[PDB]
Amino acid sequence: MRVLTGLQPSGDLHIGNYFGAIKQMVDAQEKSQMFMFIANYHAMTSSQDGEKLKQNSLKAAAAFLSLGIDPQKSVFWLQSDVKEVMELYWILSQFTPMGLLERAHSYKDKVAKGLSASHGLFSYPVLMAADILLFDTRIVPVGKDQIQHVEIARDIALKVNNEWGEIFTLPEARVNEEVAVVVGTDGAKMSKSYQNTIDIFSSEKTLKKQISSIVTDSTALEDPKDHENCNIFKIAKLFLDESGQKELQIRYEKGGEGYGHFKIYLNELVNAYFKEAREKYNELLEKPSHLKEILDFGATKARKIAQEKMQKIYEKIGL
Amino acid sequence: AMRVLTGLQPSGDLHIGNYFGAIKQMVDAQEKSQMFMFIANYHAMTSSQDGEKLKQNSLKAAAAFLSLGIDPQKSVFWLQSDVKEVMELYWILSQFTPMGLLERAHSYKDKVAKGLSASHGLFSYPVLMAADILLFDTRIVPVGKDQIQHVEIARDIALKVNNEWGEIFTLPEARVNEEVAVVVGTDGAKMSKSYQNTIDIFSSEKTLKKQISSIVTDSTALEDPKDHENCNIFKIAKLFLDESGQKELQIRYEKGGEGYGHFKIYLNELVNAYFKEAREKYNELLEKPSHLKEILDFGATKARKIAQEKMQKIYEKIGL
Numbered sequence: 337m338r339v340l341t342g343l344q345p346s347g348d349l350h351i352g353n354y355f356g357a358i359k360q361m362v363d364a365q366e367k368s369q370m371f372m373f374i375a376n377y378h379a380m381t382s383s384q385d386g387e388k389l390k391q392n393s394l395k396a397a398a399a400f401l402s403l404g405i406d407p408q409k410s411v412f413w414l415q416s417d418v419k420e421v422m423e424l425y426w427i428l429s430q431f432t433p434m435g436l437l438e439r440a441h442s443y444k445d446k447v448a449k450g451l452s453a454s455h456g457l458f459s460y461p462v463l464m465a466a467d468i469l470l471f472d473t474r475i476v477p478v479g480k481d482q483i484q485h486v487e488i489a490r491d492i493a494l495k496v497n498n499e500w501g502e503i504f505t506l507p508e509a510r511v512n513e514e515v516a517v518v519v520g521t522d523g524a525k526m527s528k529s530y531q532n533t534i535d536i537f538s539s540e541k542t543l544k545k546q547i548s549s550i551v552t553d554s555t556a557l558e559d560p561k562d563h564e565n566c567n568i569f570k571i572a573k574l575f576l577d578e579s580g581q582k583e584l585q586i587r588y589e590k591g592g593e594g595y596g597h598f599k600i601y602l603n604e605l606v607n608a609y610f611k612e613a614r615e616k617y618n619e620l621l622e623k624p625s626h627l628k629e630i631l632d633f634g635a636t637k638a639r640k641i642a643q644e645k646m647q648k649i650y651e652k653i654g655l
Numbered sequence: 656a657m658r659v660l661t662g663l664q665p666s667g668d669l670h671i672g673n674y675f676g677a678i679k680q681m682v683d684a685q686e687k688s689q690m691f692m693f694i695a696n697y698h699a700m701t702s703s704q705d706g707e708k709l710k711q712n713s714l715k716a717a718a719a720f721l722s723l724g725i726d727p728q729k730s731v732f733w734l735q736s737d738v739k740e741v742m743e744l745y746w747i748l749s750q751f752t753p754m755g756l757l758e759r760a761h762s763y764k765d766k767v768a769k770g771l772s773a774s775h776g777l778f779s780y781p782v783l784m785a786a787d788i789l790l791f792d793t794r795i796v797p798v799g800k801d802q803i804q805h806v807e808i809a810r811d812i813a814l815k816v817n818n819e820w821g822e823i824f825t826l827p828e829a830r831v832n833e834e835v836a837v838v839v840g841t842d843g844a845k846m847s848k849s850y851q852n853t854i855d856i857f858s859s860e861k862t863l864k865k866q867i868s869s870i871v872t873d874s875t876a877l878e879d880p881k882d883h884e885n886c887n888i889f890k891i892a893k894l895f896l897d898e899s900g901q902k903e904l905q906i907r908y909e910k911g912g913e914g915y916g917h918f919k920i921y922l923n924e925l926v927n928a929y930f931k932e933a934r935e936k937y938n939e940l941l942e943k944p945s946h947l948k949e950i951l952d953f954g955a956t957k958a959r960k961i962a963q964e965k966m967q968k969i970y971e972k973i974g975l
């Protein structure tokens with residue numbers, strides 16, 4: 337069962353991304369050969385500022401490598417280096433009823449929040465179907481809002497298979513509901529669109545600003561504090577084993593220590609936890625030639641698989 | 656010396672109406688125009704996914720146009736799918752294409768109006784066509800009224816792109832070719848495949864004999880003078896005859912003593928001799944695939960160099 341994950345290059349990774357998905361992805365690499373790609377063609381649907389898009393791609397590559405993606409075990413590349421996905425995209429469009437795409441909620445949702453009503457935004461799910469189907473993907477790890485896109489991919493595969501014979505694997509979404517939802521600085525679900533994030537690859541000065549923004553109770557410094565509902569505790573939990581959690585909890589219930597101290601402590605836990613990844617990340621961005629090499633290594637492996645599939649597709653479509 | 660670009664998407668068998676109505680003009684434009692012509696095989700995928708047939712149609716189309724006069728040395732002639740850059744450009748242009756432009760395309764509207772369901776491919780092809788045009792800095796796109804809106808769409812995309820990124824694309828213009836003398840079919844009506852009134856270029860002599868035999872004549876006795884002004888044999892023969900050739904035929908008509916059966920026999924001789932070289936070349940290109948490939952490969956290298964230069968500029972703007 338091939339697992340394939342496309343990764344958005346847009347924006348800074350935050351601890352919610354890390355504990356909610358990335359860590360699981362990294363720890364799954366010994367279980368099977370996993371496929372992961374930075375989806376920079378898809379990033380063009382929300383911006384055409386090339387200088388920014390290009391840096392976003394480099395940074396995303398460096399972030400995921402530094403967080404534990406192993407290019408030896410896995411197949412990790414930049415979407416735009418394997419150009420076969422473009423041709424399959426066009427071929428798959430001949431099998432995609434407009435009806436299927438007009439219904440898609442993701443286009444409506446993105447338009448409603450201000451994105452441009454463009455052909456690229458509308459066509460987003462077809463290109464993603466090409467990503468999935470080109471590599472005979474069985475399982476697509478996604479957030480809940482990308483489930484329908486995977487479903488669209490499958491519907492397309494069914495239409496192709498019905499016409500051409502069983503040439504595509506039928507993909508299914510995998511969402512993990514087991515995972516804790518990481519609260520942001522305001523108490524709501526941590527997300528970039530809420531600007532309530534604690535970012536992984538920021539300077540200590542920047543991280544301090546973020547942690548300081550965390551909303552808390554009005555409870556006096558002297559009085560016992562409720563750990564169960566405290567955002568700081570809730571985030572600290574991510575960095576603490578059983579004893580450390582209890583030790584912090586005990587500081588909460590004693591009084592004489594304030595949330596300002598708890599924030600100081602959280603800064604320490606966060607800086608220490610991602611210390612190694614941050615240095616690796618800055619190290620990769622400092623010498624971009626090594627990053628290009630890692631990405632090229634990954635592309636070579638993905639391209640071989642893509643080229644094998646395209647040869648079969650070429651037979652069916654007459655290329 | 657403005658660049659003229661035409662995508663070619665033939666269907667069924669080519670007939671003398673396609674030839675004298677469009678192809679000859681295109682062939683003759685080569686010496687004094689900068690002509691780019693491609694077999695639009697990506698676009699043919701919108702109405703068929705029968706790969707076996709699609710592959711053959713492409714080979715036949717390339718062989719046919721080469722046989723009838725496309726000069727690979729003078730012009731740039733290639734198979735669309737050999738220059739893959741066009742797919743990448745198509746995706747980039749989609750980001751600059753508002754939905755309303757494509758929703759208003761008649762090719763999509765007409766389909767939905769007659770009840771049918773449309774594929775994303777049908778909806779999206781004006782964008783791919785815009786990529787075809789813009790990739791090569793086309794100034795002039797020779798098209799049928801059919802296609803005017805598509806060129807306008809390509810023009811709107813280019814303007815949007817240029818507004819965002821600078822001088823990236825040349826603004827293309829449609830050229831409707833006017834107003835070419837219609838070719839009469841075997842039945843008196845305009846020759847067309849829909850009517851089954853055609854005379855085909857690359858058929859067997861048996862099939863040509865059959866088509867010519869079907870030409871509608873008048874009931875005039877064998878020996879009597881024939882009226883060349885109303886005769887479809889004569890009207891069709893004119894295409895293959897110079898002014899004094901027609902005159903010699905017309906004398907034969909006015910003289911009498913020769914029947915329409917004999918004029919049809921004559922018409923066969925004219926058509927077979929006129930296309931003899933093209934047919935032999937056509938068949939040769941299909942029987943020895945390597946020769947056609949060499950020619951298509953050459954065309955593709957000339958077009959690809961231009962496409963690569965455009966993409967280098969595009970890459971700087973989109974971050975690739």
Ligand SMILES: Nc1ncnc2c1ncn2[C@@H]1O[C@H](COP(=O)(O)OP(=O)(O)O)[C@@H](O)[C@H]1O
Nearest residue numbers: 352353356357479516517518525526527528529
């Ligand atoms: N606050 C969060 N808590 C748990 N998981 C999260 C959180 N934010 C993102 N994820 C995970 O990361 C993925 C979605 O990332 P994404 O939506 O692009 O980032 P963002 O939160 O900024 O909007 C999903 O797998 C989701 O499970």
Ligand SMILES: Nc1ncnc2c1ncn2[C@@H]1O[C@H](COP(=O)(O)OP(=O)(O)O)[C@@H](O)[C@H]1O
Nearest residue numbers: 672673676677799836837838845846847848849
């Ligand atoms: N009878 C004709 N006389 C003049 N030109 C023609 C004729 N039939 C076709 N053409 C030319 O050939 C081109 C393609 O026509 P096409 O759609 O292949 O014909 P049909 O109606 O047989 O399908 C047109 O752009 C037109 O200019």
Ligand SMILES: N[C@@H](Cc1c[nH]c2ccccc12)C(=O)O
Nearest residue numbers: 341342343344375378464467468
């Ligand atoms: N749409 C995905 C990114 C993506 C692109 N192609 C994919 C293929 C498979 C899985 C995910 C993707 C996201 O928003 O995160």
Ligand SMILES: N[C@@H](Cc1c[nH]c2ccccc12)C(=O)O
Nearest residue numbers: 660661662664695698784787788
């Ligand atoms: N759409 C054209 C063929 C075509 C594809 N791309 C083009 C670019 C320019 C001119 C024509 C084309 C037709 O139906 O005949």
Ligand code: NA
Nearest residue numbers: 527528529530
């Ligand atoms: Na978000």
Ligand code: NA
Nearest residue numbers: 847848849850
């Ligand atoms: Na017709």
